């Protein structure tokens, strides 16, 4: 029952800690990250479940107390992905908050500003600190986790992006800039005389993204080849040990590396690769092979698509006369949780 | 107008605008008062605003807003030890620079700039007699203007006679307890209270000494008449719900509110009528913690102006309370004897080292005392030490120590109330 | 026992017998020995155990386990002929 807790802590004088904020159970597992309050076990794996997943355009997925991509209220900052839902502002917040918040069309969230009074609902501090902690002892198998950076704590980010240029991609994503002369991508073709020295010349990066071709051959350099020289220049690229910044890397693979070279290449980046597809009507157009530490990378993974398929996929384009195009919009929304770590600024 | 506002900074800094000819809070340009911590104007509505925040605090002890503007975005929290104020990002981002709080966030021992032990700093720069001005700034709420409270000319020392208290919303009788401090003749105590644990704590500690009611409100002006005739009555409204201490926030002046109210209707029933000019006294107490509009609303009822009067400069606590009274002398400076333990440490016992010279009631900082290398709470007799309660005062009856610690925190503090109740001594009989 | 209680409590019994569960008639209601008067019917001084944070049921439990004061002053009293005094 969340409209019960209004009672349960005003009359009964019960501390918001003892009740889940999410659904209004009465048996937490454990505390709620971002605000003040409990949260129970089938919450808590919801929310870890929707805990970096955002829309196409560029928003959160979900509501981010809660996890309900239901209902969504927009958060009125150009730095805030933060969205909401109306059960939640009226529950927590009383009894017509969210149709007021809904007609007033220029509202800041809670987490942008706080000086609103709040009926019941009360923010954590630290809450960026409190989200990493809670991932790290409430996540099965926790991964490469970096805790989430402030606002005007978030620098532009410095991208390597190796046999691809990704400068058209990211600036599109706001992540790049076009009115800059001085480049805040390094892109490069040829990699094989590169020496360490020469990445580290080419000043510290945030970033580092790695693509084999596709079918259309530009040249004939095995596919394995280029995945070696990513590890490599991944390996340079790394920051100096006891750096606290966030540092990512991301390597894609358009299905040009049989199954031997591909489970070498599964060994040699420490994981097992996420395959993202176009369905289009149901059927399979294209699909993509990643590796990287990117948040939430793991759960686009569409374990329907059978390797046989993809071998199928692989056979019918190399033998069609088309010239072969990047696949820009599969891997274009696997940069979107980095919205949270780094400068972002459109036009 | 937030653009035009930043606007009006960078003029500021170009020399072009006076820092003190703009409202550093929020930017606006109706300038009626100054900024008493630091530099700038102040308009009104953030007067207001610092009002109802500037004592406000977090679960975690901290400052539930920014000191700059009792309002701002992200805050930046202290790491001086005993200083609970936050800094939020956006007001950094003016008086220090626009790179210096992303800056001084890397800086791990990281100290305010109240606690700065520079002082000054480049466009912002911290005002000398902050505490005079800070105590002056409660002298300033002359928004609410009123006739000084009536003063009665002293009865002689052969015709005083003792004291007749009514007493509302007692709690655990601190008012009887502290006028037995003062050697005051008590002819009878009538005490309305609902909670039974406190009952019991004044039905043993006062022996024969108290007559005891039911509900407040259920108190007709009939009751009153037939109780004799009082010549002090005290009250003060829960702050339970009333603070921002307490998670569960659903009103602000549902319950409490209604129970200022009857201590109102019960100051009026006891009153004694115009032409009879016999000695009459009333205290009412409430928390700093509170509505502006709420706080204009107890002033026109009780028709006074609150006299602020926090327990540190007497106790081991942070207990700034407002109190509305006819009491003499209740304006004047507090004295702290040397009984009154100021040192947190003192009121600790044996075996105990506190890092803290002053507790505030409410990984993180829970509890106050390092003890055996270990965080653990006050303990409940110390408690009542902070207060100033005589030892083991509230060990009645069998309650659990989370009862029995609430039961204390809601309590006034023992030396301020016998500041503000030592001139009843000039009216009534003494032991 | 009617001695030892606190004002305000009249007790039904004259002894109480450790080793009508709760011995008092407060205000027409059957009530515990408080911690206090449990101190003061063992004869130990007046609010001794009220050291630290504990709760009602372990103090209680604490006072029920120790020796009768004034019965250990009877036997303790005639080692001031062997030892020195203040
Ligand atoms: N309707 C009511 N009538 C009487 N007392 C009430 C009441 N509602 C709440 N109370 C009690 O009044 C107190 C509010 S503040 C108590 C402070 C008191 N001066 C003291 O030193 O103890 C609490 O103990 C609360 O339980
Ligand atoms: N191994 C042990 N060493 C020391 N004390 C022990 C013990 N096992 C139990 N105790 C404690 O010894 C007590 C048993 S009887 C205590 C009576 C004591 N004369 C008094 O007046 O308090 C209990 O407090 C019990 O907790
Ligand atoms: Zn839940
Ligand atoms: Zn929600
Ligand atoms: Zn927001
Ligand atoms: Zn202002
Ligand atoms: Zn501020
Ligand atoms: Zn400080």
Same mark, same amino acid.
């Given at each position: @029952?969340?409209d ?11 501390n ?22 409990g ?27 809660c996890?309900?991509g239901?209902?969504?209220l927009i ?8 969205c909401?839902?109306?059960e939640?502002?009226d529950?927590?917040? @009383? ?10 069309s220029?509202?800041?969230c ?6 609103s009074?709040? @009926?019941?609902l009360?923010?954590?501090?630290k809450w960026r ?25 978030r ?8 046999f ?12 790049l800039e ?9 892109h ?8 360490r020295k020469?990445?580290?010349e ?6 580092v993204? @790695?693509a ?10 095995p ?5 070696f020289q990513?590890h ?9 040990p006891? *750096?606290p ?15 031997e070279?591909?489970?070498?290449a599964?060994?040699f ?5 996420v ?7 149901? *059927? ?7 590796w990287?530490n ?5 759960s ?5 698509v ?20 990047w696949p820009?919009?599969?891997?274009k929304?696997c ?9 972002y600024?459109?036009t | ?13 170009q ?6 000819? %703009?409202?550093?809070?929020?930017g ?14 102040m ?9 109802e925040?500037?004592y406000?605090y ?7 807003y920014?000191?700059?503007?009792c ?7 202290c ?8 800094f939020?990002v ?10 210096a ?15 700065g ?9 911290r ?7 800070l105590?002056?700034?409660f ?5 609410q ?5 009536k ?5 002689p020392?052969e ?15 601190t008012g009887?307890l ?11 105590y009538?005490?309305?209270?609902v909670?039974?644990?406190? %009952?019991?704590?004044?039905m ?19 009751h %009153?008449?037939?109780w004799?005739?009082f010549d ?8 339970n ?12 002046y ?11 209707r019960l ?11 016999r000695?009459?006294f ?17 002033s026109?009822?009780l028709?006074?102006?609150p ?11 942070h207990?700034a ?16 004897t040397?009984?009154?333990?100021l040192?947190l ?10 890092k803290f010279s ?9 509890f106050?005392?390092?003890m ?9 007799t ?6 100033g309660?005589?030892?083991?005062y ?5 309650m659990?120590?989370?009862?029995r ?10 030396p301020?109330?016998?500041?503000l ?5 000039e009216?009534?009989?003494?032991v």
């Amino acid at each position: @029952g969340r409209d019960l807790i209004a009672y349960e802590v005003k009359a009964n004088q019960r501390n918001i800690e003892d009740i889940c904020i999410c659904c209004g159970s009465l048996q937490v597992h454990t505390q709620h990250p971002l605000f003040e309050g409990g949260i129970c076990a089938p919450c808590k794996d919801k929310f870890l479940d929707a805990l970096f997943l955002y829309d196409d355009d560029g928003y959160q997925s979900y509501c981010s107390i809660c996890c309900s991509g239901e209902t969504l209220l927009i958060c009125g900052n150009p730095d805030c992905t933060r969205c909401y839902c109306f059960e939640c502002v009226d529950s927590l917040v @009383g009894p017509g908050t969210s149709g007021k918040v809904h007609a007033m069309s220029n509202w800041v969230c809670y987490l942008c500003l706080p000086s609103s009074r709040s @009926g019941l609902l009360q923010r954590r501090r630290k809450w960026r600190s409190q989200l990493k902690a809670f991932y790290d002892r409430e996540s099965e198998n926790p991964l490469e986790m970096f805790e989430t950076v402030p606002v005007w704590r978030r620098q532009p980010v410095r991208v390597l992006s190796l046999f691809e240029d990704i400068k058209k991609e990211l600036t599109s994503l706001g992540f790049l800039e076009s009115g800059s002369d001085p480049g805040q991508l390094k892109h490069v073709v040829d990699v094989t005389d590169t020496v360490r020295k020469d990445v580290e010349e080419w000043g510290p990066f945030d970033l580092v993204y @790695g693509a084999t071709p596709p079918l259309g051959h530009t040249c004939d350099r095995p596919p394995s080849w280029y995945l070696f020289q990513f590890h490599r220049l991944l390996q340079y690229a790394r920051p100096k040990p006891g *750096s606290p910044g966030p540092f990512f890397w991301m390597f894609v693979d358009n299905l040009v590396l049989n199954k031997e070279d591909l489970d070498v290449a599964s060994r040699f980046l420490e994981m097992e690769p996420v395959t993202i597809p176009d369905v289009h009507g149901g *059927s399979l157009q294209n699909a993509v092979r990643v590796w990287s530490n990117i948040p939430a990378i793991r759960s686009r993974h569409w374990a329907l698509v059978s390797e046989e398929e993809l071998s199928l996929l692989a056979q019918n384009k190399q033998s069609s006369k088309l010239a072969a195009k990047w696949p820009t919009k599969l891997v274009k929304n696997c940069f979107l949780p980095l919205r949270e770590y780094f400068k972002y600024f459109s036009t | 107008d937030e653009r035009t506002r930043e606007r009006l900074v960078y003029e500021v800094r170009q020399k072009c605008r006076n820092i003190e000819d %703009i409202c550093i809070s929020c930017g606006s340009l109706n300038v009626t008062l100054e900024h008493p911590l630091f530099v700038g104007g102040m308009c009104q509505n953030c007067k207001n605003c610092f009002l109802e925040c500037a004592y406000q605090y977090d679960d975690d002890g901290y400052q539930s807003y920014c000191t700059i503007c009792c309002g701002g975005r992200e805050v930046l929290m202290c790491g001086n030890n005993n200083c609970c104020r936050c800094f939020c990002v956006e007001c950094v981002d003016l008086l220090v620079g626009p790179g210096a709080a992303q800056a001084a966030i890397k800086e791990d021992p990281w100290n305010c700039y109240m606690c700065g032990h520079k002082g000054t700093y480049g466009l912002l720069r911290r005002r000398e007699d902050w505490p005079s001005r800070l105590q002056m700034f409660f002298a300033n709420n002359h928004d609410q203007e009123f006739d000084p409270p009536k003063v009665y000319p002293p009865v002689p020392a052969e015709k005083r006679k003792p004291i007749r208290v009514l007493s509302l919303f007692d709690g655990i009788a601190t008012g009887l307890l502290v006028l037995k401090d003062l050697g005051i003749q008590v002819d009878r105590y009538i005490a309305s209270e609902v909670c039974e644990d406190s %009952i019991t704590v004044g039905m043993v500690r006062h022996q024969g000494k108290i007559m005891y009611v039911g509900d407040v409100r259920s108190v007709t002006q009939k009751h %009153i008449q037939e109780w004799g005739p009082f010549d002090l009555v005290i009250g003060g409204s829960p702050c339970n719900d009333l603070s921002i201490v307490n998670p569960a926030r659903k009103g602000l002046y549902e319950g409490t509110g209604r129970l200022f109210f009857e201590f109102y209707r019960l100051l009026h029933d006891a009153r004694p009528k115009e032409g009879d000019d016999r000695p009459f006294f009333w205290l009412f107490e409430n928390v700093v913690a509170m509505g502006v509009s709420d706080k204009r609303d107890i002033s026109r009822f009780l028709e006074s102006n609150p006299v602020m009067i926090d327990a540190k400069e007497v106790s081991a606590a942070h207990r700034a309370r407002y109190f509305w009274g006819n009491l003499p002398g209740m304006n004047r400076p507090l004295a702290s004897t040397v009984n009154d333990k100021l040192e947190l440490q003192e009121c600790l016992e044996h075996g105990r080292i506190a890092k803290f010279s002053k507790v505030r009631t409410i990984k993180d900082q829970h509890f106050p005392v390092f003890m055996n290398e270990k965080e653990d709470i006050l303990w409940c007799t110390e408690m009542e030490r902070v207060f100033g309660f005589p030892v083991h005062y509230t060990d009645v009856s069998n309650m659990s120590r989370l009862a029995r610690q609430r039961l204390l925190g809601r309590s006034w503090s023992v030396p301020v109330i016998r500041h503000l109740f030592a001139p009843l001594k000039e009216y009534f009989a003494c032991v």
